[model samples]
Target: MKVLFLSADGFEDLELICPLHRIKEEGHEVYVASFERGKITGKHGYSVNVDLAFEEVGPDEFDALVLPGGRAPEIVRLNEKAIEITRKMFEAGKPVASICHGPQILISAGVLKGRKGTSTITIRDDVVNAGAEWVNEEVVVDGNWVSSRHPGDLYAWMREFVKLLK
Candidate 1:
């Protein structure tokens, strides 16, 4: 399986790293993407390489997508290509796992309506405002959408998300 991960600077460290390795352990090829190819730093200062830039890869290139949280979403949500990728992935019924502020991209992509999910409390309003049901849980899986509140829920988050890959 070709799994794609979207992130930028300030991405929650564990939210990005934990699921990344967990997905890799399952033998799926994971690719990271950002505004440009190179490296992006996490909130806690962890640097990971970007396999492709948003400008270089289309949503169909991967089977699934991992969207980690933090301030990265604040920046990522503004990129039109990022929104396009998220919209196309969701529309295609591809598994999409978003954690914390990660759903900001989903909300911006206009794909959360009528979907149930969870995110950090900070965006509970935005989640609901986006016409989606917001639950205060460790993980919420609604069809192809799997969402978690924060890094504290990382274990349960990736566990449910990987199930879709199978």
Candidate 2:
């Protein structure tokens, strides 16, 4: 199945790259869809190229969506197109995994209401205010959305996420 990895400017370097690598390693058709085309830099100063443009791709073309965390979530949340894509994925019952502060995108989409999730300590209020039952853990899978506290916990997070998708 095809997995769409979505990101925006200033995403976490590890959160964005590691999960994408793992998904591709497992032989899934993975595409990195950035907010725009060209080289996008991470919050930690790492740079990577977007495999496709978010505006250029149709959400229905992919089986699932994964969003990586960082300051990018805050910026991407403001982009109406990005928010619509995320909300569409969630509403369609497709697997939508997020890590670190990634759930901020869900919050912005107004779809986190009543969902359980985890994120970095800094955004706990944002998660709760968005209507998600905030959990403090290494990872939390609520429905199709998977999340973790930080990059250090990505292994367990992605493992559970991929297992659920499988």
Candidate 3:
């Protein structure tokens, strides 16, 4: 399976790396795309190379999409192309996994309108206001969308994501 990770600087370190490593270990092809093609630093200062630029890749190219939470989502959500990529994935019924503030992009893409999901408490109101049934669970899987509260929920989040991928 081909997976695409949409993220940027200031992303939650563990939120992005843990699931990414696990997905790759399962023999899937993973690609990291950001606003630019270079290196992006995580909130904790961890850095990874950006495999592709957001504008350079099409959402249909991947089988799944992963959005890692952090302050990056606050900025990424403003990019129309990023939101469109997310919208395309949902429109195609592809699996999409997001954690913490990651759902900010989903809210912006207008995909969470009746979906049940979870995110960090800081954005509980935002998710709820977007018309999603917000829960405080470690992981919530609503159809093709999988979401988790925060970095600590990484294990559960990825478990559901891998299952959906299969």
Against the unseen true structure, what C-alpha lDDT does each candidate score? 0.93, 0.84, 0.92
The residue-by-residue lDDT of candidate 3 on 2-35, one tens digit each, is 9999999999999889888999999999999899
Off by over 4 Å in 3: none
Off by over 4 Å in 1: none
**What is the lDDT for 33 in model 3?**
89
CA lDDT of 9 in candidate 1? 91
- Please, what is the TM-score per model? 0.98, 0.94, 0.98
lDDT of 2 by residue, 1-166 (tens): 8998778778899998888789888889888877678888888888888888778778787888888988888877887877888899888989888888788888989998888988998989888888888889998877788788998898888888888668
Clashes (N, CA, C under 3 Å) per candidate: 0, 0, 0
lDDT per residue for candidate 1 within 1-166, as digits (tens), equals 9999999999998989988899899999999999999899998999999999898887888899999999999999999999999899998999999999999999999998899999999999999999999999999999999999888898898889889999
- Residue pairs with backbone atoms closer than 3 Å in model 1 (clashes): none
Q: Which stretches of candidate 2 lie over 4 Å from their true place?
A: none
